[model samples]
Target: SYHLDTTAPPPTNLSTLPNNTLFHLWRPRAHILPAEGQIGDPCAHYTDPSTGLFHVGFLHDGDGIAGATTANLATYTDTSDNGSFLIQPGGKNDPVAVFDGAVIPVGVNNTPTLLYTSVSFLPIHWSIPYTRGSETQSLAVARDGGRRFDKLDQGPVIADHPFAVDVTAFRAPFVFRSARLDVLLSLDEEVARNETAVQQAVDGWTEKNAPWYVAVSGGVHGVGPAQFLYRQNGGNASEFQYWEYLGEWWQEATNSSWGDEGTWAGRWGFNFETGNVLFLTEEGHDPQTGEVFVTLGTEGSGLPIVPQVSSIHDMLWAAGEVGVGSEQEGAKVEFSPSMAGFLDWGFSAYAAAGKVLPASSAVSKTSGVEVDRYVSFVWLTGDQYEQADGFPTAQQGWTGSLLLPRELKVQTVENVVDNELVREEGVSWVVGESDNQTATLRTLGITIARETKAALLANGSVTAEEDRTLQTAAVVPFAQSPSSKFFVLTAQLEFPASARSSPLQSGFEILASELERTAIYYQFSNESLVVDRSQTSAAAPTNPGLDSFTESGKLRLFDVIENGQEQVETLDLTVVVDNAVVEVYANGRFALSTWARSWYDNSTQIRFFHNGEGEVQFRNVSVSEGLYNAWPER
Candidate 1:
């Protein structure tokens, strides 16, 4: 029922293409992409309670906020009226640029409202005073049942940094409700009368009575990256016009005394943006037992942008709890050093916007068993390569795409000590405190949104499938379709103990041709998963910052021993490729998203290689073609 759209004619040399052309080759077909220009920072998300439609907003062409609505994640309808964006930048002082907005139920009559950031002015030099140019939290309202948003007369809700601290990069406001136990305990004895009565009131009180907290992302001058906190001062449950500043609620230590010069949990980056916090509780667990997970974008990681390795900006997260400070101090977020890590250990995904959905609405693997689940979408930046190279994304008009939606939750894990691998029941990326015998750790559990998985299962056509054991290289054969460039590939690999020690990495080559191929492999030496793009293109990078880069993430490859019998170590992989953009997911725990260079040659082939001399088994290997285009109108 869907037709393949015609793409722009591929130029002989992408370096020579005009940078402002309207169309371009290698446009992502199965993912969320803008029709023209570029898009990033998925924000202002709201699922319409009236119509059951999920609405998402993103930065469109660096100009204003663009809107799209979807009944399901499979296909999306552009809600922009004749190319006009949902909310344009025309607030106080006629700001030229606007970014990351949140749709909260705080408008007139509790209608869905937009709280956004407006850049009133941009300073060409970094030394310009922030008073003349900085981002401010602004306001807008949607009166037509979440269709369009008009700027409120109140203008910026947070006009400036409300504290005496020297804050830089102030932007991205996230609003949510959190329970404060300190408020309940402060009730006068006359109000409660007795201890039993206080206990009764505590058992009945819910987060509904909890005050609303807003987290603003930024960093200090001398301090490290931090999140500015605020609480509703004096407004009704759903109508607020004022907020009480609570200082730097959670700031990472700038001193290198923490995790090896910001390489690990304790240290973040130069600044923070798109800060969000979600409270998650299990199905039968007490509400107080729930944990708070925070997600945000950090810049200036103090690491060089090594194309395939690391980038200057990263989407990082931490699992912690909300601390109830004294009445005079206010509440704060306390992060555990062991429970912090990168959401996606790749260079491209950044500026992620996170939201917690009701377990009844969104589909999770835990389904009816879990209470609340969180999901996030990240902006896939092309900072590794310049537009002048054969990449031509900017030269042909459109630029970046979005990472696959990620479902987030806390998982419990066990860490081994002194060669004793004591397994425990747990979760994903972030680690927790460990002991000698067994340590119960908490980590972020990441998975592709089940809504996206359902769309692929219902719409994608399986072209190739196999279950085989191989000791050498092999190619996967499938029917060739016009849109064969887009596919979803899933495979489970088993490696024997002999193969684990071999100097070779065993994996697959995708988008392969005689001259160019992108390698996706598992390395035993470093215990990591890598996306090697060294031989993807012969053309030298024109950007001075560009280099031959490979993206990788540390993937723990544990041994599978049953009943004290030696066995193979298994690695599960899910690779989703949409023309130029590629995402490799391992064991539903680690994800690496990046752009590959093979799309320029129009490669649509798949090959598996066993670089080690040991035998490897491939099980449940399958490739499905042509994901239903999210932007079918294009």
Candidate 2:
């Protein structure tokens, strides 16, 4: 009966589309450079999309006349050594010449040689190169153009190998243009015996490869070993190399809690139109803490744009003023507002901006172009409860799904709404009436006395003499006993109680230990006479209380008092009231109401009971003719 109506309204908006879209950039599998052991070097070919023409030039590797190119020479195999193939637009085959394999012959010693490690494009026709030697070396632009082999003038030697150490381990060079032209170098080794030795080698290499003096313009540079080499006056190359000592990058060994290995391997830089360097470094401080931090460079200036403590993922696109030596330094990088809100509201994970889209027919083949859109879903589930504690209790172990959509671009959200309603019925009872004035001749008080005996001896009882005296007395007069000469008076009548007051609030109060165990008794009184067995005594000798009791059968006057003495003082009592049901003690105990004729059914009856004292106290006792409403309160 307490269940909610399913017809009522439910709470949320269930009609909207439950999904969003997203896009991400994919990195190329391998670099388009030359092989490790080819005889000739590699070169760069810029193909114009409009004209379909290629501008050919060699990929310079610091002072070395080396050119590089890549091809999927064969199916990549460990024995093949050529790796994957490069499928260009046209069928033209541009073979890259190799410089040297694992070793290079320099001077007298057959020490390990380092070829062109990495390649990048410069502003003009001149290309910069990095090399390995005792003196700090760099391949500068030749203003006086010629094919003179010894005419190679060193503009700036970023670093050089100090002492007698062999420096053939440089690799992976990338040029970043943000605030300045910065050259990044990746050091590759076959294997390191221990982590300490690897760290030492990285430290030494970092010192030897640092940029000595930055070039702002061109000038006729000094020649010979004194100008290029660091130890001309008998000092180590590390001491003479005029590097600003920025920082070093190392691989996290045993303690890898700092950052994920994937992030380290995928580290890259963003190039802008201005000729500046934007450096991105991955740093891990502690293994146990698992803290990974990143540092990025500002716009076309060598200074840091924002604080170094900012999140790497948060720095997406650069906006605002971006120039060198300006008060407002680099390009301002910020997260997209819509994406940020989506992430905050549990709609997305790691919301990033400037996301490049994959290959799609919906857009043109332009590389740098991008697009935006949004998506969402719901997980449905239920709450449960135990049955022993009644209804509406929530049950346990219930689970729901997690609603999420992939490839979603976020947009503005709008218009949301929710609403719910519950319904119950009242209680009803039965009715009936009565009419026979022959029982009324004895008056209200005398009628109570006659009806009391009729109820008590209805089942016939035994007297001192072994005879059916009580049963015979119900239909006949008094009878004398043979020996004792005692006469037994027989009376049979139906006495019904009448309603005494309107809106009857004057009822007796019963007190019991518990409300469930109490019952009410009614008695009738004439002048001052007390009735015995023939009369029903409303005042039974027992604790009086309005306790609830069972009532299923007809009322018996004798059962009203099981052991107490029977008195004949009051008039006959018609009914006995209990907590569960009403019992008509005598002649059905019908008492008509004031408006019983017009308002209720003619068979309707009323029963009244007084206090436990068995005294009928009435105020303004006036006799009336018509029937009064018994249950006026209803």
Candidate 3:
């Protein structure tokens, strides 16, 4: 397979498209994006069960070896001045993960605040044909709130120094910590030496037969349970010699009934609050939907079992065991041990609470996801595209967008409450509206704007025609900023417009200082709501991130009826402005976040506005505050 070079510009060759090309991947505006180009090894984290930090198991790359970090923003925020840069340090290298002392890996929102002590192990390492480099697993630590990374020894904790070898250029690494040690795993890629050797094995050398090595550090945070690999002889020669781990090794079926294809490359992730160990595995083929085999490691009715070659669950439908399903069909699947052991982990309730299933059950349907719900899609050039036959030889064509987990998974953002009288570890009262008696208030800039304004600043009702005159706009000042740094606001507008008139635009805005503020407004003018942070600060091109923020093309809100008369459904807009961050949710449909500086002490007043010489009404105003971001510090 060929890869693109980011060190320069895209090369042009007769303007023809290449075969087996992987198009640029789509990343949600609100996700943690990786460096562009050279992405490979690919692992995933669903959630950090214990620390609210896990991978987005559903979606999923980067570059050769390059250097230097740029701060279109900053390296670190100076309490006396500003903050650190979130931009990637350009060049060519696949990126990894980050660690912040701010999160203890439990939950989010810190009252007062979620401060941090250090920044460590942010490396962009890859290997051959890609960004060839060492694929090792390293560790770092901080104390008393220091933010510098300490040296983590010269060699990689996991490398080719000791074996026959297997590695991916772009590797996704996961580290589960405890006071005692870290449970780390990586791909040794040690597949059969040659294609012929693979088929020549005692059994077909399918991906299920790939070589792997597991690592365990002395100790870290939230101690994970003990696991002993039964490395009993299987069928291959190197099978017993594929990879190595400092821990004990025992083989499978050595003592009990052996599992045919007992788990492959997928590693383990831990969920602390509930003591759940999630083992996500697969070989990227049909049986897709993969498998989330779990075990509570219990004895019987009194508890659970850790279904590690030992699955025995008693699911009682009375407790929600039936839907005990994962999330996607073909797109979703879960597993429990053979239970033949009769140990009885949690076959029900504790066996369920993913309390909600989306896409990966309920959330995907009622949630407005039509066509692209639960399935994988691959774009291929049929089997006709001819290519060179070398290296691994005899290739024809290829596929892209593994479309599994292809549909979008919307998030249920918590209504962040500004109060402190709540659970120290809960996502409940970010604050919400039980439902209020409200009305359409069209204030024609009575307080500010370009059209007729309705003064609904006090009353929840407004006149369709102020004294027989169709009012042009509406306005309202919700609260003084800083009153709640964290917030969510949703509303619907039913303003029908004429061809000669402009589309209506309305939502919440922050007025920090004259000529300096940001607004998340709907553009009936264009059938979209946007987070306009253009004037959020002085454009800092020197920083690289501020210059080009939002552009013409983007995502969407629900479909709107263009010519429908008097029909205006939920334009539903939610905005969460936490500290220096601004996140806007449209119809709970699409979202995007950006950075901004608080013009006036980062605190001011907020208001509602409508433009475009037309009539519009605002209803269902659900404005709530968020927590102190107890994360990292909470």
Candidate 4:
């Protein structure tokens, strides 16, 4: 249904590839990708309460923020075109470029507003002053029902760096509402010791008795990557004008790992970008009462077992509690992160954006029931320039796609009696409480957005292929036709307990053929979920390189036990392959999203195998396909 031009070959000697041959092939049909050019950090729009429409905005080309609207998360309609961008760059008095941003409902009329990163025209020279001028936060207001936006006459909200702190990077503004806490008022402030004074100050900042808070991404020269917090200045909620600096929300040690066994939360990169905060509040509770997590895209390196796997641009998260801290030598707002970890242990996902779905859109059709949860969108970059020849699609035009939206929530286990293997220090619990006898554990939960599953199935696009079993070394009998490249595969696997002490790897081979295969498997010995793309292709550009490598994360999937007995008996795996994109989830705990666009023709089948000694039993193995094309043009 989609047209692909194949008239003239790409103008290079690096293998003969016809022009536009990769248009609708490697390009995602079920994911969010522009028809041409590229997309940058996501600017997730909070769901429209009246229409239940969710908007996803991103940096369109080098111009500005462009967006699309969707009633169901599965499909989208472009809300803006080339000349009708919501916010454009290089205004009369605005920065030369705009980066990451967020769209929120503001004003008495609930006017849609965009808060984005405005970059100066100065070329990046990696100097302190240049970095400061290069990034700042600004605002734009939609006057005509969000068709277009005009820069606020008030100018940049945060136009200057902190009084004396030397910041190396600063951008990405995230805003949320939280009930005012007593800890927010510092008694250290000379005049704020009395209760009446605190109450009066609180009243000024309350919006429905909740105050607005902002988190900006940046790093201090002498310190490390930090999420700087700011409070909305007391005034009209509709006005997008003022804010009071609170100080660093949370700053971590630069280039250092912080987690159990040094595997959960990876190394803290030198700087951070696209920092975001999610408020996981319970019903009838203050936003700050439940849990708070800060997510950031780091600019550092990793210590992966795969030499070619570079974690320099990893997306990570930290669970923390908000409290008053010593700020400006006095009491001020702060966020203290207790535990941290990776969002996706893959090379392709980065600079993500998150939003709490509105109550109307929260009811997932998958269960025909309602639930409370947060959702996130990620920027899926390809392995372009990882080698000398660059991305195969570069010659065809277009780059990058948004990963499927993921539903997020934090799961907690309380008052554990048998705390042997469930000890807080032994497992990757983001926040926990423990004594000599008992313990409490908190872990983040991630899954494919239920809305996506419900909509895809409701439309009758998916096909249930098989329910079969396999043992030891065997492949699934199903082989996909060339036109059937999109599908979902799930399996329940059990291996010998003896293999726990030995080596065991049981998983699927994707985009697989004789010469190229991407493996997604679980290692029983180390409780690790791995995605190996080292042999993804046999050609030059698509061949193994820095982007084609292995990524494994130690998961505590079996740590939960009763009377010192392991609870998890079998491994549960769910893998979704959307042409070039691969998203793997295991036991609802571990996720790895990567890319594999092999240039080889006829490399389109999937295989299953067991690489260890003991026979592994794979039961209820199912493959489903026929997802509807997300793009209307197709």
Residue 431 in model 3: lDDT: 21
> Would you give me the overall lDDT of model 4?
0.65
Error of 3 at 337 (Å): 31
Q: Give, for candidate 1, the lowest lDDT window spanning 10 residues.
A: 418-427
Give all candidate RMSDs, comma-separated: 5.7, 44.2, 22.4, 5.2
lDDT (Cα, tens digit) per residue for candidate 3, span 1-634: 3354422222332113354232321111111122222211112212222222112111111221111111110011111111111111121221343211111122112111111111122332111121224233332222122122222333333333223322211122222111101111111123322333332342322323332222211111132222222111232213322323433211112112212221111112221011122222121111112222222221111124232212222211100010112222220111223211101111111211111112212222333322212111111111111121121111112111111111112122222222222222211111222122212211000011000011111222211211111245655555433353444444555554342136556555663445456766666445545656676643222222232244111222222333442233445554545444454445432334444443234344576666536665566655444422111110
For residues 19-87, what per-residue lDDT tens digits would candidate 2 score against the true structure? Answer: 110000000011112232111112212222222221112222223333211111101111112321111
What count of clashes does model 2 give? 73
Worst 10-residue lDDT window, candidate 3: 443-452
Model 3 regions more than 4 Å off: 1-131, 134-169, 173-476, 479-484, 495-503, 524-527, 538-548, 551-569, 613-615, 629-634
Query: In model 3, what lDDT does residue 235 have?
Result: 21
Clashing pairs in 1: 308-549, 308-550, 308-551, 411-427, 412-426, 412-427
Computed on alpha carbons, the lDDT of every model, listed in order, comes to: 0.64, 0.18, 0.26, 0.65
> Which ten residues in a row are the worst by lDDT in model 4?
6-15
Candidate 2 lDDT at 111 equals 19
For each candidate in turn, the TM-score is 0.83, 0.18, 0.35, 0.84
The CA-based lDDT of model 1 is what? 0.64
lDDT of 2: 0.18
**lDDT winner among the candidates?**
4
